Amino acid sequence: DVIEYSKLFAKLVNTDTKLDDTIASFLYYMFPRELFIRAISLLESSDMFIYILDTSLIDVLVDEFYKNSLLEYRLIVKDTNDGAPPILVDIAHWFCSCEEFCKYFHEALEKTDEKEELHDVLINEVDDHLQFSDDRFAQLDPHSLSKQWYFKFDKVCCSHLLAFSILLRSSINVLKFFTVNSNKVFVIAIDNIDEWLNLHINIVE
Template identity: 40%
Template sequence: MDNTVNYSELFSRLLDNEGNLNNSMLTFLYYMFPRDLFIRALSLLESNDMLIYILEEGLVNDNSTGKEAERTVTLADKPTSERSTNTLEDKQDTDSIKKGNNSSDTDTHERIEDMDKLLKDIYNDDDYQLLYRLIVKSDNESPIYVDLKDWTCSCTEYCELFSKEIHSAEESNTNNSTIQDIMINEIDDIEEFKEDRVGQLDAYSFSKQRYFKIDKIMCSHLLAYSILLRSSLKNLNYFVQKKSNVLLIRISNIDEWLKLHINIVI
């Protein structure tokens, strides 16, 4: 792995002009990463085990569902005079269903547009204004929490690589070095700024660029989510919408969001 390479640009070429996986680029990336890292990341992307949980802003305090339930009245609760009009209401309901079928295409189009906008917001969220979490589910182990913002992962591979780098620094008599010195590259010269988003920390800073040394620590989970969220919007659309390999779970209830943190993130 080379720190001078723009990984975001390489990953953006993962799909060809027809929107399918580019076999030539797949082969190139396979040989570029050690430990079968790319193959494992690609397998993750196609496994249906990668999840994106997002807390939808503006829906947390929405009590419209409860209010609607309060207005619901069963037929048994209605007065006799209201029951006599039931047949007419049923006919009107049937007509409404027919009209509803005609508008189904419009509803589908609106849902697609809504999803497109949400994916675009997630992909462009460099300043981390959105609340979303990246989780990899596992049948035999605890779910894995991935954080591209700080380049961390709760998997065993990441922990082992991190520990190895710390021990190597201690053995090479660099005890005075901080973890930041060991793990992070800083670029102060604006003329040397890079466009690469993979491993970038504090992406919203205009005076300094900071990159995690991904050549030292990279697991398949961080690589997979980087391909998804740090390369090209078309990659995100491909795996979430076209192939439905990555699940986007929208949470509108703050209690459910807190349960997610208690059960998985923490």
């Protein structure tokens, strides 16, 4: 609606050391199909990883996500199901491998006309510079300074995108709340290719 979800996610941390319940009470009612609690569950539940290719860790996450940093990283969510593959989460482009994403992505195509372009169906393009938003949530890079892109997360969203959105699309202090302050979200640098390749081995088959 009228909200800047990016700042509102920054309102879940004060600093302190537990999530401001006023804000979390709001955010719950703003997402359908239980999205906000599962996003929050995932955040505390130590299935979130952020892998990097290899001066401090917290500093180079800050640099990329909070501000010319071209960093090769990976946002993985390990599944308790254990006979299940990892979950690859791309917030830059708004895509996740999870079954939840791919169901509503599919539904978005069934509601569509098959002569409609996906870009039209799934993305809000704003080219009038006076309507530019400071919201970073569900934002895509349009490859233009004359435009702004936002995915229609009403049409497709999943618990791992919202999750990593809350982590990487809000204040630095929400980032440090889950990483340097506690490890509910793991950040592993990786110095060798064979290990880098081995994260990907079951994402496709």
